[PDB]
Enzyme design. Structure first.
Site, PDB file in Angstrom:
ATOM      1  N   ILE A  73       0.832  -1.203   0.000  1.00  0.00           N
ATOM      2  CA  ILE A  73       0.000   0.000   0.000  1.00  0.00           C
ATOM      3  C   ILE A  73       0.867   1.253   0.000  1.00  0.00           C
ATOM      4  O   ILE A  73       0.630   2.187  -0.774  1.00  0.00           O
ATOM      5  CB  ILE A  73      -0.976  -0.016   1.193  1.00  0.00           C
ATOM      6  CG1 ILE A  73      -1.967  -1.175   1.080  1.00  0.00           C
ATOM      7  CG2 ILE A  73      -1.776   1.284   1.252  1.00  0.00           C
ATOM      8  CD1 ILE A  73      -2.416  -1.469  -0.329  1.00  0.00           C
TER       9      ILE A  73
ATOM     10  N   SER B  37      -8.019   0.485   9.720  1.00  0.00           N
ATOM     11  CA  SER B  37      -8.327  -0.791   9.095  1.00  0.00           C
ATOM     12  C   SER B  37      -9.745  -1.197   9.428  1.00  0.00           C
ATOM     13  O   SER B  37     -10.269  -0.848  10.486  1.00  0.00           O
ATOM     14  CB  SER B  37      -7.368  -1.894   9.570  1.00  0.00           C
ATOM     15  OG  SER B  37      -7.762  -3.154   9.051  1.00  0.00           O
TER      16      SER B  37
ATOM     17  N   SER C 179     -10.416  -4.001  10.268  1.00  0.00           N
ATOM     18  CA  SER C 179     -10.228  -4.841  11.443  1.00  0.00           C
ATOM     19  C   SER C 179     -10.377  -4.034  12.729  1.00  0.00           C
ATOM     20  O   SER C 179     -10.798  -4.582  13.752  1.00  0.00           O
ATOM     21  CB  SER C 179      -8.862  -5.533  11.394  1.00  0.00           C
ATOM     22  OG  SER C 179      -8.713  -6.289  10.202  1.00  0.00           O
TER      23      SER C 179
ATOM     24  N   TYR D 169      -4.117  -7.452  16.023  1.00  0.00           N
ATOM     25  CA  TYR D 169      -4.025  -6.427  14.986  1.00  0.00           C
ATOM     26  C   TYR D 169      -5.239  -5.512  15.038  1.00  0.00           C
ATOM     27  O   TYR D 169      -5.117  -4.284  14.945  1.00  0.00           O
ATOM     28  CB  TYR D 169      -3.907  -7.082  13.611  1.00  0.00           C
ATOM     29  CG  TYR D 169      -3.891  -6.106  12.450  1.00  0.00           C
ATOM     30  CD1 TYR D 169      -2.725  -5.440  12.090  1.00  0.00           C
ATOM     31  CD2 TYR D 169      -5.039  -5.872  11.698  1.00  0.00           C
ATOM     32  CE1 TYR D 169      -2.706  -4.541  11.024  1.00  0.00           C
ATOM     33  CE2 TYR D 169      -5.026  -4.988  10.625  1.00  0.00           C
ATOM     34  CZ  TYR D 169      -3.858  -4.321  10.297  1.00  0.00           C
ATOM     35  OH  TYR D 169      -3.842  -3.451   9.226  1.00  0.00           O
TER      36      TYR D 169
ATOM     37  N   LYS E  71      -5.319  -1.226  15.347  1.00  0.00           N
ATOM     38  CA  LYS E  71      -5.962  -0.287  14.429  1.00  0.00           C
ATOM     39  C   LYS E  71      -7.103   0.469  15.105  1.00  0.00           C
ATOM     40  O   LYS E  71      -7.379   1.616  14.729  1.00  0.00           O
ATOM     41  CB  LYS E  71      -6.395  -1.002  13.145  1.00  0.00           C
ATOM     42  CG  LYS E  71      -5.181  -1.505  12.350  1.00  0.00           C
ATOM     43  CD  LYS E  71      -4.190  -0.354  12.062  1.00  0.00           C
ATOM     44  CE  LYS E  71      -3.172  -0.717  10.973  1.00  0.00           C
ATOM     45  NZ  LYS E  71      -2.416   0.467  10.461  1.00  0.00           N
TER      46      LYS E  71
END
Lengths: 259, 259, 259, 259
Positions: free
Chosen positions: D17, D143, D145, D156, D160
């Site tokens: 990204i 994210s 997530s 993770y 985020k």
């Protein structure tokens, strides 16, 4: 130009936010079909926007978004004039405050009819016109009030909450057909806001300004549609937003935050 | 008993979720004023719940929550019978799926009238009856659909989104008067759900069960109102919830999560 | 008693909110294993709570939630003393304000270690102890700050946001094992809040009180843990909450609203 | 060009990204200071992007975003080379799945150090460099997530979530200084995603593709950074986004929806 050749319908084009979108889109090179119920004001906006962009392609159409047969006829006429339909922006809406325990049935009916049924009708007709081409862009107008909203504003807040969820729901249903649907949450100066400011005493106005200064992190003031909202509206209408759908876009200098 | 002496109005008491709340509250020692439009079924529920709790204090009242004059008269009669009003639970609501591009005006009107105007009317009348005492508890029924919702369900989803924001908004306006307002988001077996299951082919049913098993972390099945929802309804109606207002309570085994 | 026979571990039991949970649970008939790092204060709380509930079953254990081996040993010892483990409430946490551009690495490390790693460690060990029995209840402490938070409080706000999402995520993973996981968002008077009030000038205090009055719809003041939070904590620990998981429970008189 | 003359720092520019943002910004006419820890790959990206835009102004800088002294030195060097600093995009981040009950302290530390401390350090240093000019733009990478997240991904997801709330919080604190801060939530093909697909059996891959087709309304597939994400990144970096702050921008074809 960022919207060169785009075929866009904008409802509520006769005044306020809606008129600023028409102006922004015409300036960005789009072919704009502006619709409203105030025909004199609607045409005036289109005519003035043309003066600033000589040679633009634009037309005004009378349409009551609450009347589906009217939406069907007007939208189809616009799409025929333009040769198709790429974007449909539903700005038409009504505002009215009320203590939440004193809402007359007629008030409830009017606010939901314009803000909710209008959204449903415009979205449905736009969907049907765009489905065949496999791609389309619908932009609804939500509101920060749709999150929680203000004192004496539960009714309006409720209507915009409906628009927000409607937007999220149809985004999932129509995505497989190539149609994206998003909602804009603007906090801008409007005729009604100016009227509100003008009727307050000097004390109440200073109070509002101080509270607004704290409530809006970027600049502490209501935004300017042409300067602060137009650029976001152009992005949303443009191909750049093609991978976003079912989202809310607050253009309010930080007033509220999505979660 | 957890609700001993509480004076509670419950709308939609004739069937499904509403009937389970009436049963739960009567079993918890509350004085229950159950209201609906299906008078035979409404009374049947109250009568059967009484059999299981001999000596309970309960009464059924006919009321169209969409008609404010009716709500005013019925609520005032119930409050007079009970000697006051502590809690008002609005369970009455209507469900109907539809492709979002084919919603008839009559369908839109019916769903918003019952689910939204009904909420407004019941909340307003309950507020006026509770304001004088400086304390009150209003419990609205929202829905997981009000967050985003399902395919062919944008209309219903929109109505419940309105209820959610309405709840958040009036919570701020009426909090200073001592009235708390919250929304419950249940995912339970209901007559309509059973009917849905019964009309599916064996293939479609196995598919639904597998998808529901993955979608509901706790148990993988729709809940049982009497077992899974009743205890939460009793807590919400009880004094224990006195410091919570403007919130959503998902009783769905984890189906969705508030943010 | 609402928690009769429940086997509950509570971390952070030596002071503030944590001590109020220990007191509430002991009064509700639970067998309580209180843990902290301030052994004298931790035992004092358990001892005083016993005086008010003669014959209660309770014990204090030293435990650094940031040290997984310590959590494993302490939790296993508590579960052995109690004969099992039904609920684990993680109240331990640290607060510290800081301008967001001046956060020292040591400050970042401390806040995330206690608030986030502590949550992970306690949740993980509780999960392993409860999995075999097919049912379990984990209650984390989130915060209104985890939504957005205050000026000079981005660091703490970030840690609680982590707890909120952690809670939502593990709820989906452990639900199939019968374990529910929720987060409480309290707004109560605490020693640190009293200290803050005591160090302000009369002007700054009146300002805070007026702003808090507007910010908290129900009562306009920070709540009282024993009166306003205890009843919700008892509900969450009890079987009544068995069909809710992955949710946030704001016990703040309306300060914030989930969406 | 949409970003003509803009002075932008992009962290994590060596791969995935981050590399797509560097490419997008260079193509849009921005002066780009790309930073990473993989110096060979970082320079390779800048060099290849230059080949496609002859005469561009760009430079690669080694920087460990977790080390504040390094961020301070590198950011100041870049701002000096460019003559100022208009935008800072923090793409650097780390991914690692783990069952939530088996997270080693070293794993927790690494993920929070890069994803959270890195965000804090980069944001803080960028703020200090932009404050004097009264305007600035910080873009963090959040994210989907961070909302709830996936199975075996609580760690993770938690990091985020911290970034999301951090973003919302500093937006309110730095808005009065003219600095806007937003978070992007991309769902794009990345080297790690390709590796994941390549190690699955034909069965598991077909399963993933079918589930992804249903989960992503627009197109049913993970997006392409250069085609689907680049245009949004250019808008966010550009002046067009000047009235938006503290928001989350999902560029995921509808995977998730903000609320």
């Amino acid at each position: 130009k960022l919207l060169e050749g785009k075929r866009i319908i904008v409802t509520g084009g006769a005044q306020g936010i809606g008129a600023s979108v028409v102006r922004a889109y015409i300036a960005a090179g789009a072919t704009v079909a502006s619709m409203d119920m105030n025909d004199t004001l609607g045409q005036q906006v289109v005519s003035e926007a043309g003066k600033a962009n000589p040679g633009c392609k634009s037309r005004y159409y009378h349409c009551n978004i609450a009347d589906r047969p009217e939406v069907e006829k007007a939208f189809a006429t616009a799409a025929e004039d333009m040769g198709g339909l790429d974007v449909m922006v539903n700005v038409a809406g009504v505002h009215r405050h009320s203590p939440p325990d004193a809402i007359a049935e007629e008030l409830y009916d009017m606010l939901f009819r314009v803000n909710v049924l209008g959204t449903i009708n415009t979205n449905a007709v736009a969907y049907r016109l765009m489905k065949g081409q496999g791609i389309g862009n619908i932009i609804n107008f939500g509101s920060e009030s749709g999150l929680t909203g203000e004192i004496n504003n539960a009714l309006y807040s409720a209507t915009k909450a409906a628009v927000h969820t409607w937007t999220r729901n149809v985004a999932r249903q129509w995505g497989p057909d190539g149609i994206r649907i998003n909602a804009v949450l603007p906090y801008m100066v409007t005729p009604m806001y100016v009227d509100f400011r003008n009727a307050l005493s000097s004390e109440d106005l200073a109070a509002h300004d101080a509270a607004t200064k704290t409530d809006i992190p970027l600049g502490g003031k209501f935004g300017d549609a042409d300067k602060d909202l137009a650029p976001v509206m152009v992005f949303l209408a443009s191909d750049a937003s093609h991978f976003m759908t079912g989202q809310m876009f607050p253009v309010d200098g930080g007033l509220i935050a999505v979660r």
